[PDB]
Point group: C3
Chain length 450, copies 3
C-alpha cells in the first residue's frame, strides 16, 4: 500500500510512481534543470553590472554557491523547509541528509518528495548566489562559504517554510506567493541591504552623485546573465504549478511578457531621465525587475495584467537604484534594488491582480485579490512582505555582525587590518597577487591580514 | 462542456486540461523554452561574424528584440496569425492583448491556445532578431524598435498566417513547411535583402573583392551563437509536430544530421576554394545553412535524405555569400545568404524528398513529394517560396523607404546628416562617444544628426 | 500488429507510439537536448584549463566534433552499438545509415529505436570532443577528423556495445554502469593517456615541477564549460533510466550532490596543499570529478553515498594530475586524470555502494553491491574497468601510430618537419599565420610541413 509518509511505501511491493502523473513529473524535472542555470545567470549578471573591480569573480562564485547550497540542502535545508512535521515557523531534522526522501507525495501532491527536493533545492541555490553576489566585495572566501551555510539555514529556510511549508503561517494566513518571490527575491534583497548598511563601503567614490549611475564591468556578462536568467525563469515560474497543466504555460506567457515590458520600461525611463540616451544596462535590469515582479503573481494574474508587473517594478526599481547616491553606498545595493524592492512591489501587486479564475485553470482554489473584490488580500500580502523583510534584514545583520567579532569568521576585513594587493605583490610568499587578472589567475585574490 | 471556441469553456465547471495529452503539452512547453534561447543565439552569431564594427551590439540587441517581439505578439501579433476567424491572408483582432486565449484546442489541436501562443511567439521573436541583425548597421534604436513592431505586424504575421493559419492559403494549396522555414528564415532573409539594397552601405570597403570573405569580429561569439542555435533548434523543429510522438524525435535526428553535414560541407567547400585552409567561420555558417535547410523538411523527409539538406544548402549558400563581392554590399547580406537562400533551397527540396510515410509516423496525412511520385508538390513549394520572397522583399522595402521619409522615424541617417563619433566625442554633451568599447559603455552609441 | 523488429510495424496500419509512455519519451527527448550542450561544455572546459596556447580552439573544435560524431553515428556508429543482432563484442551494419530505425522498442524498451538513437548519439559526440580535446595540441585538422571517425568506430562503439548492447558481455557478466561511465569517461581518459604517451610533448616546460599546477588560459571558459557540463549532466544521468519515473529525479539529486561535494573537496584539498590558497580551477575540476564519479552510479546508489562519489574521485583525481610532473607531459593528461581516473574510481565504488532497493525505484532488478552483501559485484566492476582501459589504451595507440606512419594521415607533425608559425608568417602564401589570435582569425593555424 501507499503510506503517504516516509519513503511512501516498500518499493519491492508497490510502484511508487503510480501515485503521480508522469508528465507532471517530467515538467518539474525539466523545470529543475532550468532553474539550475539561473545560478550562473545571477553570477554573470552581478559580475557584469558592477561599477567596481570585485576580486571575487561572481561568475565563478556562482559555481561555489551551487556547491555550498546543494550540500546545505542535502544536510538539513530540505528538511527544515519540507519535513512533513514542523511547527508553523520551521521544519525539523526528520529528513536530515535526505533520510526517507523518496516517493511519498510532497507538499505539492502532484510530485514525489525526491523530485520536489530536486526542484526546491534549486531555489535555495539561486538565493545563495544572490546573497554571495550581494556580499562579495572584499569578501574572504572561507568565511563567505560558512556564512552562506548559516544564512541558508536560519534566514532562507524559515522564510521558505512560512511560504511553502505544510504548516507555514503565511500559507495559513492566505498570503499568495506563486513562485517564491518572498524566500528568493525579497529575502535576498533585504539581506543584501543588511550587508550594505553594516559591511558595505561607505562614502564610496563610485556612489558619490557626480558619477555615472551605470558603469558596467562587462556588458557581455550582463547580457549573458540576463539570457540565462530569463531562459531559466520559465522553469522557476512555469514549474511552480507543480504540474503539466496549462496553468504552467499561462505562467510562462506572463513571465515572458513581464520581462519584456520591464526591459522596455526601464530603458524608456532611462531615456527620459538622461535626455535621450539608450541604456544598455537599463534594458537588462528592467527585464530582471519584471521577472522578479511577476514571480509571486505568474500563476495567479490575468495575462493582460502581467504588463503592469513589468512596468511598475521597472519604474520603482529604477528610482530605488538612485538611493545608492543618497547613501553613498554601492556594495550590495543592486541586489537590494532589483530583488528586495522588486520582490516587495510584485508581492504587493499580487494582492491587487490575483484572480480566482486564473488559479482555477488547473483547479487551484484561491479567494483571489482585488480582481475578485477580496480586499483583505492586500493586507495578507503586506503582512508577508513585512515579515520577510524584517526577518531577513534583522537576522542577516546579526549573522554578519556576529561573524565580524570572530577573527577567523570575519567576512570582510576592517580597513586598518587589510593588506594592499599592491603591497602583497611585493612580499615573496604573496607574489601571485601581482596578477589581478581573474581570467588567468588560478587563485582567488583573497584579502590578507597584517 | 468543452466549447472548442473562445476560452474553451468555464474553468469552474470543466477541466480544460482533459482535452489534451499532458506529455504533448510538456514537450511543447519545453520546446518553447528551447526556441527562446535561439533569440540570443542569432544575436551572438551575427555579432561575431561581422566584418565591420557595429555600434549596436547584436548580443544585446537580441534582448531588445525579445522584448519588442513579446509585446507585439501579445498586443496583436498572435491574433493576426492565429485568430480562429480570419481571411485566407490574415487573421483579426479577436485575440487583441490575448483576450480569450486559454484552453480551446489551437490550430494544432494537440495543444491549447495559451501554449500554442507561447510556442509560436518564440518564432516571431527569432525572426525579429534576424531582422534587427540584418538592419543593424548605423541603426538608430528608437526607429529600429518601431520598425520591428511594424515589420512583425505587416510582414511576419501575414506570411505566418499563410503558413500556419487555419485558413492560410499556402496550407490550402498543399505547400509543405514543417517548422516555418517560410515565416522565419526565407522571410527574414528577403527582408534582409531589401535592407541591403536600399539602406546598406554601397561600395563597401569590406566587400570590394581583394578583401577577405571571412573576417570575423569575434569567433567565440560565432561559436556561442551557433551553440545556442543548434541546441534551441531541437525545440524549433522537434516541437513543430505539436506532440510527444516519435515523429518529434525523428525530426530531431534529421535536425542534428543536417546541421552536421552542413557544417562539414561548408568547411570542405572553403578548403577546396582556399587551396587548403580550414575555415572556422565556414563550419559555423554551414551548420546554420543545414539547420535552415532542414527546417521546412524535418518532420517530412526520410532520415538518410537529411544529409542532402546539409550538403546542398551549404554549397549554394557558400556561393551566395560571394554575391556580396559583386554588389559591394556587406550590410544585411549574411542574413539573406543563410536564411533567405537557405530557406528557399530547403523549401524547394522539401518538394522532392517529402514522404507520406514519414508524416504518418504520428498519423499526419500528406500527399508527399517526389518520393511518392507527387510531382505537383514541387510546384506548391515554389509558389510558397516565391510568394514569401515577393511579399517580404516588397513590403519591407516600402516600410524602410516610408520611415526614411520621416525625420524622426528614419532608421539609418543619410551620410550628409550623420555626425562623426570622432567629432561627437569632442562636443561636451556627447563626450561619452569617446568610449566605443561596448563592453564597458553603458549607452548605445547611436548615430546623431547635425 | 507491432513486430518488435525492424521499423516496428507499418505506420499506415498501426500507431507505433502506442507501445510507449509519452512522458517517458518526452523526458528522454529533453535529456537528449541536454546532453548535446555538454559537447561545447567539454570544449570550453579544456580550452580554458590549458596551460599552453593551443592553435586549435577547443570551443570551436566542439562544433567540429558534434558534426563528425553525428555523421559517424548515422553512418554506422548507431548500428555497431545497437543493431538488435550482433555478437557479444560488436553489432552489425543492419542499421547502416539508420536503415529501419524507427518505432521498434529499443534495447531500452521504454523508448523507440529512433529516440534511443537520438539520445545515445549524444554520448558518442561527448566522447568525440573529449578525445579531440585530449589530442588537440599541434593537431592537423584533416587527420584529426579522420582519426575521430576511426576512433568512434573501433574504440567507442565496441566499448559501448559491451556496456549497452543487447548481448554486450559486460551486461551479461553483471557489471553496473548506470550512465555509461565506461564508454564515455574511462574510455576517453585512457585514450587520452595513449595520446599523452605516444604523441604528447615530452619534457614539456609547463610540466617541469617548479612550475604552477594551475595556469589557466581562460578561467571564464573553464567556468562556462563547467556550467554547460553540470546543466547537461542532468540529461546525461537523469535520462539513463530511459523513463519518467522518480528514479530519474533520484539520479539527478545524486548528480547535483556529487558535483557539489567534488567541487568543495578538490578546492579544500588545494587549500591544504597550497598552504591556504583558494583554487579557482580546482573548484571546477572537482565538480567534474564528482560528475564523472557518480556517472556509473547515479541510479544505483543511496543519496547519502553520492557525497562519497564527490569526495573520493576529487581527492584521487587531484593527485593523479600531479603525475604530469613526474612524466613531464602536459598534453592529453587532464582528460586522462578527470575522465580516465575519475571513471575508473567511480566504476569501482559503484560495486561498493550499489543498492537493489535504489534500482527498484522504477522496478529495475539488480543484485546490488556491497550494500547488499553482493561481494562479487566489485569483481565485475574491476573486470569492466580493466577491459575498457585495456581496449581503449591499446587500440587508440595502434590507431595513432598507424596514422603517424602515413604522411597525409599523420595527426601531429614530427618536430623536424614542423614549420614555425613565426616563419610561416614571413612566407607570402602563409602570411595569415601572423594573426595567432583565434578570436579574429578566420582560419585554423594548422601545422605546415617543410
Amino acid at each position: 500500500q501507499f503510506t503517504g509518509t516516509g519513503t511512501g511505501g516498500d518499493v519491492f511491493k508497490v510502484d511508487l510512481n503510480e501515485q503521480f502523473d508522469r508528465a507532471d513529473m517530467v515538467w518539474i524535472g525539466t523545470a529543475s534543470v532550468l532553474v539550475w542555470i539561473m545560478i550562473p545567470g545571477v553570477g554573470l549578471l552581478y559580475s557584469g553590472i558592477s561599477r567596481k573591480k570585485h576580486a571575487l569573480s561572481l561568475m565563478w562564485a556562482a559555481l561555489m554557491a551551487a556547491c555550498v547550497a546543494a550540500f546545505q540542502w542535502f544536510w538539513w535545508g530540505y528538511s527544515l523547509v519540507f519535513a512533513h512535521n514542523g511547527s508553523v515557523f520551521l521544519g525539523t531534522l526528520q529528513n536530515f541528509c535526505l533520510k526517507d526522501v523518496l516517493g511519498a507525495p510532497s507538499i505539492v501532491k502532484t510530485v514525489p518528495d525526491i523530485l520536489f527536493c530536486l526542484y526546491q533545492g534549486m531555489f535555495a541555490a539561486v538565493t545563495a548566489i544572490l546573497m554571495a553576489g550581494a556580499g562579495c566585495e572584499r569578501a574572504r572566501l572561507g568565511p563567505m562559504m560558512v556564512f552562506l551555510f548559516i544564512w541558508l539555514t536560519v534566514v532562507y529556510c524559515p522564510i521558505a517554510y512560512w511560504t511553502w511549508g505544510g504548516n507555514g503561517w503565511l500559507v495559513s494566513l492566505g498570503a499568495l506567493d506563486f513562485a517564491g518571490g518572498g524566500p528568493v527575491h525579497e529575502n535576498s534583497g533585504f539581506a543584501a541591504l543588511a550587508y550594505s548598511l553594516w559591511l558595505g563601503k561607505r562614502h564610496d567614490p563610485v556612489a558619490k552623485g557626480k558619477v555615472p549611475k551605470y558603469k558596467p564591468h562587462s556588458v557581455s556578462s550582463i547580457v549573458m546573465g540576463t539570457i540565462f536568467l530569463w531562459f531559466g525563469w520559465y522553469g522557476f515560474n512555469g514549474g511552480s504549478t507543480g504540474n503539466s497543466s496549462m496553468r504552467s504555460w499561462y505562467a510562462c506567457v506572463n513571465t515572458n511578457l513581464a520581462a519584456a515590458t520591464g526591459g522596455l520600461t526601464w530603458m524608456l525611463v532611462d531615456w527620459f531621465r538622461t535626455g535621450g540616451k539608450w541604456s544598455t544596462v537599463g534594458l537588462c535590469m528592467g527585464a530582471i525587475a519584471g521577472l522578479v515582479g511577476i514571480t509571486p503573481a505568474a500563476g495567479y494574474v490575468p495575462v493582460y495584467t502581467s504588463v503592469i508587473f513589468g512596468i511598475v517594478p521597472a519604474i520603482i526599481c529604477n528610482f530605488a537604484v538612485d538611493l545608492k547616491d543618497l547613501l553613498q553606498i554601492d556594495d550590495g545595493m543592486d541586489v537590494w534594488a532589483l530583488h528586495g524592492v522588486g520582490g516587495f512591489v510584485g508581492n504587493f501587486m499580487t494582492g491587487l491582480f490575483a484572480a480566482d479564475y486564473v488559479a482555477m485553470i488547473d483547479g487551484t482554489e484561491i479567494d483571489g485579490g482585488w480582481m475578485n473584490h477580496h480586499w483583505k488580500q492586500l493586507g495578507y500580502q503586506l503582512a508577508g512582505s513585512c515579515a520577510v523583510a524584517a526577518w531577513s534584514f534583522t537576522v542577516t545583520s546579526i549573522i554578519l555582525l556576529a561573524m565580524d567579532r570572530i577573527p577567523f569568521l570575519r567576512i570582510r576585513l576592517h580597513e586598518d587590518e587589510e593588506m594592499l594587493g599592491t603591497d602583497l605583490a611585493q612580499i615573496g610568499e604573496y607574489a601571485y597577487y601581482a596578477d589581478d587578472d581573474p581570467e588567468t589567475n588560478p587563485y582567488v585574490l583573497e584579502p590578507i591580514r597584517s
